[PDB]
Design an enzyme around this catalytic site. Structure first.
Site, mmCIF file in Angstrom:
data_model
loop_
_atom_site.group_PDB
_atom_site.id
_atom_site.type_symbol
_atom_site.label_atom_id
_atom_site.label_comp_id
_atom_site.label_asym_id
_atom_site.label_seq_id
_atom_site.Cartn_x
_atom_site.Cartn_y
_atom_site.Cartn_z
ATOM 1 N N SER A 93 -44.957 32.576 27.208
ATOM 2 C CA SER A 93 -45.185 33.123 28.655
ATOM 3 C C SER A 93 -46.621 34.443 28.024
ATOM 4 O O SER A 93 -47.171 34.638 29.836
ATOM 5 C CB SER A 93 -44.768 33.702 28.791
ATOM 6 N N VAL A 143 -46.065 28.825 30.386
ATOM 7 C CA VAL A 143 -45.959 27.900 30.298
ATOM 8 C C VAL A 143 -44.987 26.389 29.928
ATOM 9 O O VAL A 143 -44.072 27.344 29.559
ATOM 10 C CB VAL A 143 -46.971 27.507 28.076
ATOM 11 N N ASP A 200 -63.746 38.399 22.863
ATOM 12 C CA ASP A 200 -62.524 38.216 22.948
ATOM 13 C C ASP A 200 -61.527 37.550 22.243
ATOM 14 O O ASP A 200 -60.538 36.844 22.494
ATOM 15 C CB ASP A 200 -62.201 38.522 24.172
HETATM 16 O O1 LIG Z 1 -51.712 29.429 27.491
HETATM 17 C C1 LIG Z 1 -51.148 28.748 26.390
HETATM 18 N N1 LIG Z 1 -50.552 29.339 25.326
HETATM 19 C C2 LIG Z 1 -49.912 31.113 24.868
HETATM 20 C C3 LIG Z 1 -49.066 31.503 26.023
HETATM 21 C C4 LIG Z 1 -48.521 32.135 24.716
HETATM 22 O O2 LIG Z 1 -49.577 33.566 24.333
HETATM 23 C C5 LIG Z 1 -50.705 33.191 24.304
HETATM 24 C C6 LIG Z 1 -51.000 31.817 24.825
HETATM 25 N N2 LIG Z 1 -49.839 28.311 24.621
HETATM 26 C C7 LIG Z 1 -50.481 27.537 24.673
HETATM 27 C C8 LIG Z 1 -50.375 25.753 23.617
HETATM 28 C C9 LIG Z 1 -50.652 24.805 24.857
HETATM 29 C C10 LIG Z 1 -50.963 23.659 23.468
HETATM 30 N N3 LIG Z 1 -49.901 23.788 23.035
HETATM 31 C C11 LIG Z 1 -48.563 25.285 22.637
HETATM 32 N N4 LIG Z 1 -47.703 24.041 22.104
HETATM 33 C C12 LIG Z 1 -46.584 25.916 21.478
HETATM 34 C C13 LIG Z 1 -45.208 25.299 21.552
HETATM 35 C C14 LIG Z 1 -44.668 26.128 21.408
HETATM 36 C C15 LIG Z 1 -45.216 26.517 19.281
HETATM 37 C C16 LIG Z 1 -46.020 27.449 20.298
HETATM 38 C C17 LIG Z 1 -47.499 26.396 20.919
HETATM 39 C C18 LIG Z 1 -48.927 25.799 23.137
HETATM 40 N N5 LIG Z 1 -51.079 28.151 26.446
HETATM 41 C C19 LIG Z 1 -51.491 26.557 26.856
HETATM 42 C C20 LIG Z 1 -51.611 25.465 27.117
HETATM 43 C C21 LIG Z 1 -51.735 24.319 28.224
HETATM 44 C C22 LIG Z 1 -53.275 24.683 28.711
HETATM 45 C C23 LIG Z 1 -53.626 23.874 29.355
HETATM 46 C C24 LIG Z 1 -55.544 24.155 29.532
HETATM 47 C C25 LIG Z 1 -55.912 25.529 29.283
HETATM 48 C C26 LIG Z 1 -54.818 26.160 28.571
HETATM 49 C C27 LIG Z 1 -53.940 26.137 27.746
HETATM 50 C C28 LIG Z 1 -53.612 26.702 26.995
#
Ligand SMILES: O=c1n(C2CCOCC2)nc(-c2ccnc(NC3CCCCC3)c2)n1-c1ccc2ccccc2c1
Length: 329
Positions: A27, A30, A141
């Site tokens: 969060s 996502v 940033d």
């Molecule tokens: O915004 C996020 N976050 C986090 C949210 C929590 O705080 C920091 C940023 N993590 C991911 C993201 C993107 C791709 N893969 C993952 N996989 C997770 C699987 C579980 C372990 C952590 C990575 C997350 N995304 C995310 C997802 C989809 C997105 C689509 C378009 C542009 C940016 C994006 C970013």
């Protein structure tokens, strides 16, 4: 219908039917999903009413616009953009879709330091940062929580920059103006944390943060001082003075693997790049291109990866239409 609604905690995910089995992965909330059309797992980000204020709206519009100005494997690339709402009047939420990644960089920082993986991660950060700078985008940033990694150690930067302030450069902390090497500081702050396993420059605000910068690196040169604005200059020059600890003392040998000659050398090279990145004065700080040529990094160098071809104020009503237009194309 084309859409269906699923409850993920408190927020409702109304997504295209192609995206199945949604699970929360952090969060903007996502979700991980299976894309039935592409036949691969995706990450979907929900922007809840991004037009709600100047801050949320300006970033959402900028980043939606920039995600199609960028074409690089170390920077986020959009797979799909959509809204469930049918008209501009009903328009509420924006959903962004990208390739699903395995880990956040915060998790990888907690891991044991291995030179092959550390240098490749850092190499990829520099490639992405260089690609941004080539497109006229200086991040300012850059932080680990906005960087994601795959199991094969491929890396992606998720945002486009200018809340955790620890990785921000002195020129951002003191409002100085900047060039491209502002992002080098941030890379140095990540690289140092991978070694120390502690946030290098913590603090509840910029005052604490700057104290941590000068205590460890020492008071900057007079040339740096005269580049500050008179009011900031007064504060910085009247801070308690420090000589600054040497980099062998900042990152002791015990923090590095020294079980072989390969590891002993790579440890000295790693401490050396740190001493060139964690430099307060940007006039003395290493550039992106020189960091890429550093012995610790250049082992991964590739011309195809490194050398790649490349704002107003509105009301909440005006931002709504601007964002809606970009989604609908
Ligand atoms: O915004 C996020 N976050 C986090 C949210 C929590 O705080 C920091 C940023 N993590 C991911 C993201 C993107 C791709 N893969 C993952 N996989 C997770 C699987 C579980 C372990 C952590 C990575 C997350 N995304 C995310 C997802 C989809 C997105 C689509 C378009 C542009 C940016 C994006 C970013």
């Amino acid at each position: 219908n084309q859409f269906y609604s699923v409850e993920v905690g408190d927020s409702t995910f109304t997504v295209l039917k192609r995206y199945q089995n949604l699970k929360p992965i952090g969060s903007g909330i996502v979700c991980a999903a299976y894309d039935a059309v592409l036949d691969r797992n995706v990450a979907i980000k929900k922007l809840s009413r991004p037009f709600q204020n100047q801050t949320h709206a300006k970033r959402a519009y900028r980043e939606l616009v920039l995600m199609k100005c960028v074409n690089h494997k170390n920077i986020i690339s959009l797979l799909n953009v959509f809204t469930p709402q049918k008209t501009l009047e009903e328009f509420q939420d924006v959903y962004l879709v990208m390739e699903l990644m395995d880990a956040n960089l915060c998790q990888v920082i907690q891991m044991e330091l291995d030179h092959e993986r550390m240098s490749y991660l850092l190499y990829q950060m520099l490639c992405g940062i260089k690609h941004l700078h080539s497109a006229g985008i200086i991040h300012r940033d850059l932080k680990p929580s906005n960087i994601v990694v795959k199991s094969d150690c491929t890396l992606k930067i998720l945002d486009f920059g200018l809340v955790t302030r620890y990785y921000r450069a002195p020129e951002v902390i003191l409002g100085m103006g900047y060039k491209e090497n502002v992002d080098i500081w941030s890379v140095g702050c990540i690289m140092g944390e991978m070694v120390r396993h502690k946030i290098l420059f913590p603090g509840r605000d910029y005052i604490d943060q700057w104290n941590k910068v000068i205590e460890q690196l020492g008071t900057p040169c007079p040339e740096f001082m005269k580049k500050l604005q008179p009011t900031v200059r007064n504060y910085v020059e009247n801070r308690p003075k420090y000589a600054g600890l040497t980099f062998p003392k900042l990152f002791p040998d015990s923090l590095f693997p020294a079980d072989s000659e390969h590891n002993k050398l790579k440890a000295s090279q790693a401490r050396d790049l740190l001493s060139k990145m964690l430099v307060i004065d940007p006039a003395k700080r290493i550039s992106v291109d020189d960091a890429l040529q550093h012995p610790y990094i250049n082992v991964w160098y590739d011309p195809a990866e490194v050398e790649a071809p490349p704002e107003r104020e509105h009301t909440i009503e005006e931002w709504k239409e601007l964002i809606y237009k970009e989604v609908m194309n």
